[PDB]
Assembly symmetry: C3
Homo-oligomer: 318 residues x 3
C-alpha cells in the first residue's frame, strides 16, 4: 500500500540505513523499479515538480552529488548547490544550528554531505525540513546501501523473502576496516537470510561491532549459524559459493577473469566506485560485472527516495 | 489592499535596484503587499510560480552564501531559472576584461542579473553597460537594498502603523553595536527616516553612527514634520538605550551582548532583529524569548526577494494574474 | 527556407560534435536556419522552449566563464536543465579515476554532456566511453566547434553569398594578430575554406599562421575550384592587409591595434569580429563604429548553441514542432 507507506515517510529525514524499515524498503525498491523502467523507455519522469532543494556538499564527492542533482532534475524539481567548500569556509564563524535553522526556511529539503558526523546530527536537529544524508565521517551513507541492496535484489529477488531455504551468500573483499559501505550494507543484508564471506588481510578485518550487529540481526530472524560468517585470507576460498562479490575501495585482492573462473555461474560483481586497480579492466567485458549498472541504479533509487519523502500529492506505474 | 499594482508595475518594469533610494513610497507599498502574498502562498503550500520562463544570472564576486542562496531560492520558487557565477573574487572573473564589456555581453544571454561585488565602482559600471536590469545583492559602500527591504518588511509585520505617517504613532528603534561599519544600519535608517521614527544609537565611542547618516535621517524626518530634539538619541549602554523601543536591531561585529536579563526592562511588544550571522552578540537563550524575530527576519528575505523579482521582471501582467490570497 | 529539417535532424540525432569537421554542408545549413529562428524568437520575446525535459551535465575543467554561461543559458532558454561541474582543473575531478570510468558512469545520469578540458586526449576518451552525446566546448588542440559555428553564422548574416559557392561572389577575410596561437582562426579558416573565400593573414613574423592550416585551406579551396595564387596573402601591416576585405577578424593577444583611423580605408561594408575578450586590440572608440559586430557575434553564440542542442537532442521529428 504505497499510499500508507508514503504517509509514514512523508517528511522523514534519512541519515542512517536503520532509519529505513521493511515496508519503507519495499516501497523504495518498488518505486526505484518504476523509475528504472520509465527512464529506460524514455517516458515522462516528472513525478515530483515544484520542489526546491538545497544540496550542500562540504567535501569533494562529485559522483554522489551529480547523482542526487540528476535525480532532482529528472523528477522535474529544482536545486541550489553549495559545493567545493570544506566544513569551516561554509560556517565562516556561524553555528551549524543557525546555518540550518535559516537555510531550512528557503527550501523544501536538504541533501547534506559532510565528513563531520557531528554536523549532520546538528543539522537534523536544527532544520525545519527533511535532510537526506549523502555521506558523513562515521560511514553513514544510506542511499549507497539502498542502491547496493537494490542491485542485489534485481539479480537475487529471493533476498526479500526471509525463506529458510533461500539463502544469499555474499563475499566482501578488500579493506573491511575502513570500507564503511560494507558496514552499512552488511547491517541491511543481515535483516534477511544471508551469509557472509569476509575476505581481508589481517589489519583490514571487519570490525567487531559490525560482526555483532550482523549476528544480532541474523539471530533475530532465526538465520544465524556457525556457517553464517566466515573469514578468509585469499580469493580462491572466499569466492567459493557466493552469489555476490562486493569489492571495496582502497595487491593480493585484485579481481581478474582468472580469479573468477571458480565462482558460480550466476555470481554478480559489485563495487561502490571508483575502482583504482582492485578490478582489472578485462572484467568489464565479463557479464558477471554489474558495478556500472550499480552506479546507474543510484539515480533510480535516489529519485525513488525523494519522491516518497517529499511528494505532497498519481504514483509511478508502468 | 490600498493600491494599483498594475500601474506601479508599469513604472517598476525593468527597473534596476542598486540603492534603497531607488525605491519610492508606492514601490515600497507594492513590494510590501506582494511580499505578504508570497508569504501566505508559501506557508499554505500553494503554487508559487508567478514568474516562469525567465532566465537569470547570479554573479557573486565575494563569499556571501546566505544572500546568494536566498535569491536563487526566490528565482526557483517563482519558477524561473538561474545560472551562477560563484566563489570567484573580482579579478579572477574579469581575467583582464573590462567590466563594461563583461556586462554588455552577459546581459544579451539573460533577462536580469543579480550582482554582488565589494567594489562599489563595478556595480555602477554594470548598471551602465548592462542592457538588462540589475539587482544589487550588496557592495562595498554598504548599498544592500533587499536587506533594508526585508528589514522594513519585518518591522511592518509587527508595527504596521509605521506606514501611516501619523503624528501620534511613532516607532522607536534602537540600533546597537558597531554603528560605524554596520552599513545595514545606515541603509535601514535612511528608509525608516521616511516615516514617523525615533532613533536610539547604542554604541561605544569609536563605533558611532556616521555624521552624514545622522544628517540624512534629520533631513528625511524634517521633510515630513517628524523631527524633534528627541528624534535621535545616543547611548553608552543597553539599559538606557533599550528603554522604550518597539524594535531592537543588533549588528554584526563585549558590552552590548543581548541576554534575557537585559531584555526584562524592554516593552512587552518589542521585537528583536539581527541581519545575521550572530557570533556572540545575542545569547542563544534569547532564541526562546518570543521577542526574538531574527530567524523570521532571515526567512522574510525569500518573500521580499520573490516580490522584488516579480514586480521588476513580469512581462505578462494583467490585474488578475497577480498573487492574491 | 531551402531544406528538409526533419531529415537532417534524423541524421544529427545523438551526434557528438568535437571538431568543425564533424559538421557537414547540410548540417551547417540546418544549424544556420535554426540559429536564425532562435534569434527572431528571442528578440521578439516569444516562447523559446523548443527542448524541455532534457537534463544536461556541463563539465568545465578550466575557467571559461563566457562559453560556459552561454551554453547554460542556451540549455535553460530551451527549457531544459543543467548540472554544473565547474572551477575544477583536470586532476581534482578524476581524483584518481580513469576518464573512461568517469564518463561511462556520468553518461548514465544525463541526456548529454558539455565538456571543456585543456587536454585534447580527455575529450576523445570521453567520446569513446560516453553512452551519450558530447559537445566539445573547447580543448587544448584548439578544437572549439560552436565558436566557429557562431563566427560563420555572424559572417553569413552580413554576407549570405558565402553559402553559394559562386565563382563570381568571393568573400575576402583578414585575420589579424597572433595567428600561431589563435586557434579560433585555425578552426574558422578550415570552415571558411569549404566556400569561395580569400584570406589575408596579417601578422608579425613569429606569430604567423601555421603551415598545416595553410595546407588545409589550400586543399579545401582546390577541391571546389577556388584556389588561385591570390587566395592566400600574407601581410606585415594593417593598411595593406585591410584593403579589400569584407570581414576583419581580430585575435586575442602593438602594431595591430584597431582604430577608427586604421578603418578609414576599408570597404564600407566591412564587418569587424573578435572572439573576445579584447584587451585593447580594439580601441573602445570602434564600438561606436557601425562596422563593429563583435558584441553581436558574442550574442549570436546563444542562438547557435540553442540551435545545435535542439537539432542534436530533440527526440524526435516533428514537422509541426520546429522553430519558425
Amino acid at each position: 500500500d504505497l499510499d500508507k507507506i508514503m504517509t509514514k515517510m512523508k517528511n522523514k529525514s534519512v541519515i542512517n540505513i536503520d532509519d529505513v524499515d521493511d515496508e519503507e524498503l519495499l516501497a523504495i525498491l518498488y518505486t526505484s523499479k518504476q523509475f528504472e523502467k520509465i527512464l529506460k523507455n524514455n517516458e515522462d519522469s516528472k513525478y515530483l515538480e515544484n520542489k526546491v532543494f538545497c544540496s550542500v556538499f562540504l567535501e569533494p564527492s562529485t559522483r554522489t552529488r551529480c547523482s542526487f542533482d540528476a535525480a532532482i532534475l529528472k523528477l522535474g524539481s529544482k536545486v541550489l548547490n553549495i559545493t567545493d567548500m570544506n566544513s569551516t569556509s561554509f560556517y565562516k564563524g556561524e553555528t551549524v544550528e543557525d546555518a540550518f535553522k535559516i537555510l531550512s526556511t528557503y527550501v523544501d529539503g536538504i541533501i547534506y554531505r559532510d565528513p563531520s558526523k557531528k554536523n549532520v546530527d546538528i543539522a537534523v536537529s536544527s532544520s525545519s525540513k527533511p535532510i537526506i544524508n549523502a555521506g558523513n565521517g562515521t560511514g553513514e551513507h544510506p542511499t549507497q546501501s539502498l542502491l547496493d541492496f537494490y542491485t542485489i535484489h534485481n539479480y537475487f529477488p529471493f533476498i526479500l523473502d526471509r525463506n529458510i531455504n533461500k539463502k544469499l551468500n555474499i563475499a566482501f573483499v578488500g579493506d573491511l576496516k575502513n570500507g564503511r559501505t560494507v558496514h552499512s550494507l552488511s547491517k541491511l543484508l543481515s535483516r534477511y537470510n544471508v551469509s557472509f564471506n569476509f575476505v581481508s588481510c589481517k589489519s583490514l578485518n571487519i570490525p567487531k561491532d559490525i560482526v555483532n550487529t550482523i549476528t544480532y540481526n541474523l539471530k533475530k530472524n532465526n538465520f544465524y549459524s556457525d556457517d553464517s560468517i566466515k573469514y578468509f585470507d585469499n580469493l580462491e576460498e572466499g569466492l567459493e559459493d557466493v552469489h555476490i562479490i562486493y569489492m571495496t575501495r582502497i595487491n593480493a585482492f585484485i579481481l581478474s577473469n582468472k580469479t573468477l573462473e571458480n565462482t558460480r555461474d550466476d555470481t554478480k560483481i559489485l563495487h561502490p566506485l571508483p575502482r583504482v586497480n582492485e578490478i582489472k579492466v578485462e572484467v568489464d567485458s565479463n557479464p558477471k560485472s554489474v558495478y556500472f549498472t550499480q552506479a546507474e541504479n543510484g539515480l533510480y533509487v535516489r529519485m525513488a527516495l525523494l519522491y516518497l519523502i517529499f511528494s505532497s500529492t498519481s504514483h509511478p506505474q508502468f
